[PDB]
């Protein structure tokens, strides 16, 4: 049943945001869940697939790879919508190094993902927080038995469109992804511009396809990851008039994928971007 309506619940997380205790509450949480084992991703022929080093996948949500060696820095991370049979599927998961970037396309294949959404731009005051995994066009790239092009590179003002055509160069099969890379849009920060990033989750949103999972990546692929993911699932609970609990969201994110929205800062822009929505879900 809810706890308050979706009107009451509305009015606590603004009277919590301007009394201060939403943020306190958000820096009680922990970071990682009691008793999930992390154990496959510090073996030793793991270490260096982490591109930082304590931002580790739980053994139990870890997404396997096939054959030898099953691992990767990645997380299933499924949110369910209470009781309208929603559950939005999500693979969070790292900026993949240079030797990752076989594994990365694997997973891409391996599920026949239609949508990457990368939270990042490449470089961040020089330093590299994501290996570009793509080709630039017309160039082609050969990433563990797969070929990649990209066929398509559009911009816009916080974030550049590319479609993506991958290959399996044994058999000739063909798989198109779509790739969505926002780039005004900081480590550890919060969106540039709050609308441009409303209007890119709504994107996002008409993209997904039901039981299908929308891989998301940042450079560690837990803060502005846990955003956007926290974002959508507000969206899907507003249309619906179910009441938000952005730290319950956040803790069930948490169960998934350890350290789920990073900062204090990207909290509190998500808890006031969820009150907007909600304001204009009531005009229309």
């Given at each position: 049943?809810?706890?308050?309506?979706?009107?009451?619940?509305?009015?606590?997380?603004?009277?919590?945001?301007?009394?201060?205790?939403?943020?306190?509450?958000?820096?009680?949480?922990?970071?990682?869940?009691?008793?999930?084992?992390?154990?496959?991703?510090?073996?030793?022929?793991?270490?260096?697939?982490?591109?930082?080093?304590?931002?580790?996948p739980?053994?139990?949500?870890?997404?396997?790879?096939?054959?030898?060696?099953?691992?990767?820095?990645?997380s299933?991370?499924?949110?369910?919508?209470?009781?309208?049979?929603?559950?939005?599927?999500?693979?969070?998961t790292?900026?993949?190094?240079?030797?990752?970037?076989?594994?990365?396309?694997?997973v891409?294949?391996?599920?026949?993902?239609?949508?990457?959404?990368?939270?990042?731009?490449?470089?961040?005051?020089?330093?590299?927080?994501?290996?570009?995994?793509?080709?630039?066009?017309?160039?082609?790239?050969?990433?563990?038995?797969?070929?990649?092009?990209?066929?398509?590179?559009?911009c816009?003002i916080?974030?550049?469109?590319?479609?993506?055509?991958?290959?399996?160069?044994?058999?000739?099969?063909?798989?198109?992804?779509?790739?969505?890379?926002?780039?005004?849009?900081?480590?550890?920060?919060?969106?540039?511009?709050?609308?441009?990033?409303?209007?890119?989750?709504?994107?996002?949103?008409?993209?997904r396809?039901?039981?299908?999972?929308?891989?998301?990546?940042?450079?560690?692929?837990?803060?502005?990851?846990?955003?956007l993911?926290?974002?959508?699932?507000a969206?899907?609970?507003?249309?619906?008039?179910?009441?938000?609990?952005?730290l319950?969201?956040?803790?069930?994110?948490?169960?998934?994928?350890?350290?789920?929205?990073?900062?204090?800062?990207?909290?509190?822009f998500?808890?006031?971007?969820?009150?907007?929505?909600?304001?204009?879900?009531?005009?229309?």
């Amino acid at each position: 049943s809810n706890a308050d309506t979706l009107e009451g619940s509305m009015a606590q997380l603004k009277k919590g945001l301007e009394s201060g205790t939403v943020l306190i509450q958000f820096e009680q949480l922990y970071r990682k869940k009691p008793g999930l084992a992390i154990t496959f991703a510090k073996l030793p022929q793991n270490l260096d697939k982490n591109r930082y080093k304590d931002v580790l996948p739980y053994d139990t949500t870890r997404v396997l790879l096939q054959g030898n060696e099953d691992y990767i820095n990645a997380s299933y991370v499924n949110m369910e919508i209470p009781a309208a049979n929603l559950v939005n599927k999500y693979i969070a998961t790292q900026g993949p190094l240079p030797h990752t970037c076989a594994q990365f396309w694997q997973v891409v294949w391996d599920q026949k993902l239609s949508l990457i959404v990368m939270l990042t731009t490449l470089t961040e005051r020089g330093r590299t927080k994501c290996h570009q995994y793509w080709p630039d066009p017309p160039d082609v790239m050969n990433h563990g038995g797969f070929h990649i092009q990209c066929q398509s590179e559009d911009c816009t003002i916080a974030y550049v469109s590319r479609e993506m055509l991958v290959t399996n160069t044994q058999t000739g099969e063909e798989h198109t992804v779509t790739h969505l890379q926002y780039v005004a849009w900081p480590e550890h920060g919060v969106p540039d511009d709050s609308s441009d990033f409303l209007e890119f989750v709504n994107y996002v949103r008409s993209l997904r396809v039901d039981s299908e999972p929308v891989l998301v990546h940042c450079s560690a692929g837990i803060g502005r990851t846990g955003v956007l993911v926290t974002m959508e699932t507000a969206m899907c609970l507003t249309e619906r008039n179910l009441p938000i609990y952005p730290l319950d969201i956040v803790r069930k994110m948490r169960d998934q994928r350890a350290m789920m929205v990073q900062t204090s800062s990207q909290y509190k822009f998500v808890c006031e971007a969820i009150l907007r929505v909600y304001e204009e879900g009531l005009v229309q």
